[PDB]
Amino acid sequence: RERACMLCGIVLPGRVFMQNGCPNCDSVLNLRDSDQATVNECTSSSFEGLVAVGDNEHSWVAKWLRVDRFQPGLYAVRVDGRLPSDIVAALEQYGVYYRPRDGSVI
């Protein structure tokens, strides 16, 4: 069982997301401090395009996927589902702009 964090794009087991949270998005999502509904709304088990990144700084793919500022690991090209409107507003409060990785927005 693995899920893809919608915001940063990382893919980790859903129980890992629940127990420890997203190592990158915890500064704005608080996924560990969030309930299962919020974990699902920010981490989706339905995705496509497993991506393994070794060096974020120099990988052109990471820049193209906007994951060059995140922890190397399992990432998904496309993630099913988008962030909820309330979470979108909460992130916009923090000044961070959310670009969907669902592919429907480009």
Binding site: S46, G49, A52, W60, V77, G81, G103, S104, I106
Partner: protein, 387 residues
């Protein structure tokens, strides 16, 4: 930004390697684990990223700078084939390898009418009352198929008959009834169905089901936007052209021009010779997209119905009311009004009646309790009997 991130010549190269089918994600995970394990060592795996795509079966793409790095990453793996089936990805392909897919529709819209792929209501039209945020399932509004104690015909859940045949009905609210573990809301079943159980495109609606669904809305088919879109899709897809067809142009600089189809290439490019008062123009052939062509039907032409209730019916054009064309039928010998989208100029009928009804030609059948006759000519809708 997004446009500025397109690759350059000095960006790291991308290699693709053939692997055994079904092991692509396994190879990706193995590569990531090897990179992490050798990270911080004297000889770290000098690569940058590696990935794969579901559509591109049997291929794993690694972003690196050296072929030796690829060999080192692939060293110690069993899914890699014996031969070094590696190739250099062209820089233009870099954007395409990571472009998204399935972007045709934004999402499933609540309230839309869809068809069911499988289950007890396989093929029944269903309204999308609820879309689950997971996207794998969705709660739908359906017409129940019950016998109350090979499937029963769809019918609104009748509480009185259900209690008479089964007095164990449950109640939870007003208008929301749960019978036999199934939740029926105001006579309509509400049941969650998986995304793999639905067809969200090319949906064919029937006025019977539309009325049965919209009767509870105090108005017959009040919602007609999705229906109009389906009508547009049916009109666009059903058009098929043949050489010699008289067509008219709807868009482009050549709008409102008549011409005859000369040749057909693929299904989207049609070579047309235009007709005009100028002789020099009539000797030119123009290739025109099919999306901007409308068939021209002249009065007194043999035309055969393509699709509909009057399928395989032929006749002669009598009245041309723009979109809708009227023609006198051949079998029923009566006027029928069908849209011009469902007509093809077929100068010969030669209709075969096989696989229809119960009787063939030259069948001695009993008309009634007194009259007995034989079949002289068969029709798609009736038969001709000499008694």
């Amino acid at each position: 930004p997004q446009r500025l991130l397109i690759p350059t010549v000095d960006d790291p190269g991308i290699w693709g390697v053939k692997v055994r089918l079904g092991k692509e994600k396994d190879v990706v995970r193995q590569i990531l684990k090897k990179k992490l394990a050798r990270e911080g060592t004297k000889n770290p795996l000098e690569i940058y990223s590696a990935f794969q795509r579901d559509s591109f079966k049997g291929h794993v793409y690694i972003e690196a700078r050296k072929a030796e790095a690829i060999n080192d990453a692939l060293k110690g793996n069993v899914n890699v084939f014996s031969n070094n089936s590696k190739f250099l990805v062209g820089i233009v392909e870099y954007k395409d390898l990571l472009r998204p897919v399935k972007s045709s529709d934004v999402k499933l819209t609540r309230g839309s009418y869809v068809r069911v792929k499988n289950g007890k209501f396989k093929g029944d039209l269903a309204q999308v009352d609820e879309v689950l945020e997971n996207g794998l399932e969705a709660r739908l509004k359906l017409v129940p198929r019950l016998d109350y104690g090979f499937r029963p015909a769809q019918r609104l859940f009748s509480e009185a008959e259900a209690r008479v045949h089964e007095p164990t009905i449950r109640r939870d609210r007003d208008g929301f009834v749960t019978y036999g573990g199934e939740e029926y809301y105001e006579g309509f079943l509400y049941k969650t169905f998986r995304l793999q159980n639905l067809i969200v495109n090319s949906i064919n609606p029937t006025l019977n089901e539309l009325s049965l669904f919209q009767s509870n809305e105090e108005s017959t088919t009040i919602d007609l936007s999705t229906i109009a879109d389906s009508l547009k899709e049916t009109a666009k897809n059903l058009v098929s052209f043949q050489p010699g067809d008289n067509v008219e142009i709807i868009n482009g600089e050549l709008n409102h021009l008549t011409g005859t189809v000369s040749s057909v290439n693929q299904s989207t490019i049609v070579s047309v010779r235009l007709h005009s008062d100028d002789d020099t123009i009539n000797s030119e052939t123009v290739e025109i997209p099919t999306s901007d062509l409308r068939k021209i039907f002249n009065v007194g032409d043999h035309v055969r119905v393509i699709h509909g209730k009057h399928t395989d019916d032929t006749g002669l054009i009598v009245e041309v009311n723009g979109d809708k064309v009227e023609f006198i039928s051949n079998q029923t010998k009566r006027t029928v009004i069908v849209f011009s989208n469902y007509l093809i100029k077929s100068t010969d009928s030669t209709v075969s009646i096989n696989e229809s009804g119960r009787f063939e030609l030259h069948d001695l059948v009993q008309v009634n309790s007194d009259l007995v006759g034989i079949v002289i000519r068969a029709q798609k809708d009736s038969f001709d009997v000499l008694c």
